[PDB]
Amino acid sequence: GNYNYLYRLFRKSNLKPFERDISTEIYQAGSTPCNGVEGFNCYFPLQSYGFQPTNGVGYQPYRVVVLSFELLHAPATVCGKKSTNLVKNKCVNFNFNG
Amino acid sequence: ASVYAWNRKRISNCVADYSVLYNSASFSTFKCYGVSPTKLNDLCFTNVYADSFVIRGDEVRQIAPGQTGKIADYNYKLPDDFTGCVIAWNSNNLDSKVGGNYNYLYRLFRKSNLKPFERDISTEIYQAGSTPCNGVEGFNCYFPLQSYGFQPTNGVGYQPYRVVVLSFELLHAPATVCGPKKSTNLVKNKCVNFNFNGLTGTGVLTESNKKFLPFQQFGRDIADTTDAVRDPQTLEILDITPCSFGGVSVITPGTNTSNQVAVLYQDVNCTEVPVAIHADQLTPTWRVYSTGSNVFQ
Amino acid sequence: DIQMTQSPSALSASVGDRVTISCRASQNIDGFLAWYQQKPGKAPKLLIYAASRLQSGIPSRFSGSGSGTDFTLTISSLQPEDFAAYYCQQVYSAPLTFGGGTKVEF
Amino acid sequence: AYTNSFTRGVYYPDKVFRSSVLHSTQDLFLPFFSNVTWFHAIHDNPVLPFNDGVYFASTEKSNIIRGWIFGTTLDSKTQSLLIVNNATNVVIKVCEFQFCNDPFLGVNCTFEYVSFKNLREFVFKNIDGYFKIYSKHTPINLVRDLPQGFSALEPLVDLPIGINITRFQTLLALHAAYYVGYLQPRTFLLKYNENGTITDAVDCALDPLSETKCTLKSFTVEKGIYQTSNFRVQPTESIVRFPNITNLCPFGEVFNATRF
Amino acid sequence: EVQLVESGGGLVQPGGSLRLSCTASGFTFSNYGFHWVRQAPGKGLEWVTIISYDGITKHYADSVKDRFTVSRDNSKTMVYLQMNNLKLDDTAVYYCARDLGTYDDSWGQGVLVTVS
Amino acid sequence: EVQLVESGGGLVQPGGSLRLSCTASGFTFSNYGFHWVRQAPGKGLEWVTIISYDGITKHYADSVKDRFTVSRDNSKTMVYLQMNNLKLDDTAVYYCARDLGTYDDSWGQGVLVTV
């Protein structure tokens, strides 16, 4: 098993979009307060994935990259087409910053 | 029951108090898969199955969806898909005695891995060798079930643990198994958001002269919305009246003539006008005045 | 091993009176104790198993309490059948020495 | 033996309370003047199709009829709903039992529930696996047949049985005739008094005047001409026309080809 | 129901060999482990020996160790407490109890053993 | 970065009990599983045993099993390999190994064990 990859088993409320919680505070599932130490119905929030070579495809690790794209009237620096000479006084199709 | 012959009890036609299980102490692990571990207690399920067995702590970590272990393979199998809560509590005090306890036993050897939610109670000798066992102990042949050894001195890792697995199934069925609500208290003559037996509306609740038939629960309006309701705890009819609403009209002479304005709230008494949720207090913001002395009904 | 003793020197109370008995271990036995009640010329009867949870076929009046070394049994109301010797043993050690015991009496 | 429904056996469709209003509802309902089958048990308990909705009308001086059995097979092969009324308690259990062709009584259950001078009317409908029973008890002075009067059946209990019921039988103790009418989906205009009790109904499909009453939404209809519905001729037969070729397409050659 | 009966207890000379019998009825004898207990007159109970369900592993009380032995036969459904080098102190009523200190615990009627 | 220092290897008579303590430093010891690799003189490398990060699951080679027992202490940060009924063929320079075959791979200087 590889312990490096972790996921948050217990959180008090659902996370807001694009919000990251790194807190390691014990979860008070039980009526009795945890008091910062393990107790009955008190658990560490993060549980390690069990990652093994022989593990099934559903349980295999997957590397995920999420790309966020912004569509605005701003300078739009991240363009990624080839520019052509400006043509003026005649009707033409044009692409300016997408 | 022993892990290999795990016992399944069907729970149906009742209200399930999961919160009592949460409150109960000594529960070493309370892991819910698919279902939310808390706040989804109310959610209704067609049937609930409780699977009961006694296993070692290492076996307790083994019994989870998509986990490979001897206890998983040859005794109790958990499918990845099912939504359920696995509950384990330490049983050292009652499941152990001097000289070991033979009461709980597990299957060392099985011909094939068990399918999910399937129990095998076969005691036939395992034919590891090519030569047949023939129903008697032989070379390369061993009894399928090996008794657990449970002792009070025995360490926590090897200590007996009592595990109940709750399985929740949803189907095209009534879903009688459910979770009740606190039910709060009745509020009358105040605008409120009210849920009566799953019927939701926003309105003032007042005493109702009209008497329903005993089976009848709610009144009828043209929109099919409720014009009256019967409280479930006490069988008293409650009239539903909408919270005060109206248009806001600004009576203004032309801006060149003056910037002074008057405001006519529609179909409202002037008592409700101070609670108009104006953003600022004592300043003429959004509304010309709310406490002004020039008030005419 | 863990030597079991009984706290009350004497035990006499009338029928219908709540009575209390105590059993403390020499070393920490956790929850490993069983309460017993033995009538004269009769087999001992295990009132409580694990010392906190009532045994089947035992009247509701008998109760199990205490945790660790300390252990106590409380009877809500006495009866003629109730009067007998009582004993406590610890299963946490392979060598076993029972509790001395006291004779609840009318 | 057959009898007419005599505008009896209508039930309250929902738990909604309505006052001084006429409400049109479409649901399974007993059509007016339906030729209800008459079964005699004097001096006859066949298995009868549930047909989704059943109306049971029993006239008994000595309350001989006790209960009914509801099941798809009813032969103990699959779970069969059972209602038995004995003394002051009614027992409802889904567990399978074997039953006689004619029940005679001397004068595995995932669901368990416990609760001619008089006419007993019962409506049974299974929708989304909910066994709904509507019961009205009305005193009757006519031994011969049903009264030609209006009574609205009130819901007794809703059961979460969740099992299909193709056919139903009836169990009665033998030392009281019963009338069975199959419900058909129908649009009914229902009259509600101020108290909320249904007083009268109109079956829209029964006659043209009833269609007019339903369209107007008023029991009283003024003089005039009213457009009620559109007449449609119904197709007598289904004609299928296809090429006469009996050749079979070589799908197998494509699918079972050794090398693609 | 679980019934336990004891036999083989009688007056014996000091240093004599006396063997007890623990009857088992109404339960699977082989599955359940068995224990032996004795109560001296006007004294608390004293545990003497234990035997495993299969009989492979045995433990003895320190006072009675190397002089008191225990054996059992699964076919005969009886546990036998052999007693040797008996003493006046050893005199007690021997109660054979199965699954001691648990919910499963049952107590035998017992047979009086006297050493005089 | 990651430093592994092995302590406990010395000359032993056949049938003796020898314990090798691999000492970690510079990382969280509990997080990473540990491996033992022996290098018999003039022979290729031979993996001995793997303990898991939790330590409940221990695997061993067929020859290694029933003669060699592996253990770890999280507080002391040390992995203890215990060898019993030692033979002349056991003689090798054992090396502590962490997360073999992965990006987290570490290596130990090693101690010569002679039987």
Author numbering:
A (entry chain E): 447 to 526, 528 to 545
B (entry chain C): 348 to 644
C (entry chain A): 1 to 106
D (entry chain D): 27 to 69, 80 to 143, 165 to 172, 186 to 245, 263 to 347
E (entry chain B): 1 to 116
F (entry chain G): 1 to 115
Direct quotes from the study:
Here, we combine monoclonal antibody (mAb) isolation with deep B cell receptor (BCR) repertoire sequencing of rhesus macaques immunized with prefusion-stabilized spike glycoprotein. Structural analysis of the spike in complex with a broadly neutralizing mAb provides a molecular basis for the observed differences in neutralization breadth between clonally related antibodies. To further examine B cell evolution influencing neutralization capability, we focused on lineage 10644. This lineage comprises mAb 23, which was cloned from the iLN-R2 compartment and identified as the most broadly neutralizing mAb in this study.
To further understand the role of SHM, we investigated the interaction between mAb 23 and a D614G-derived prefusion-stabilized spike by cryo-EM. The solved structure revealed the capacity of mAb 23 to bind with the RBD in both “up” and “down” conformations by interacting with a lateral angle with an externally exposed epitope. We mapped the epitope to 7 amino acid residues on the RBD surface (T345, R346, N440, K444, N450, Y451, and S494). RBD residues interacting with HCDR3 (R346, K444, N450 and Y451) or with the IGKV1-NL_15 LC (T345 and N440) were outside of the hACE2 binding footprint, while S494, the only residue within the hACE2 footprint, interacted with the HCDR2. Neutralization appears to occur through steric hinderance via the minimal overlap between the epitope and the interaction between RBD and the ACE2 receptor. When testing their neutralization breadth against a panel of Omicron subvariants, including BA.1, BA.2, BA.4/5, BA.4.6, BA.2.75, and BA.2.75.2 we found that the germline-reverted mAb 23 neutralized BA.1, BA.2, BA.4/5, and BA.2.75, but not BA.4.6, and BA.2.75.2. Interestingly, N440K did not impact cross-neutralization against Omicron, while R346T likely contributes to the loss in potency against BA.2.75.2.
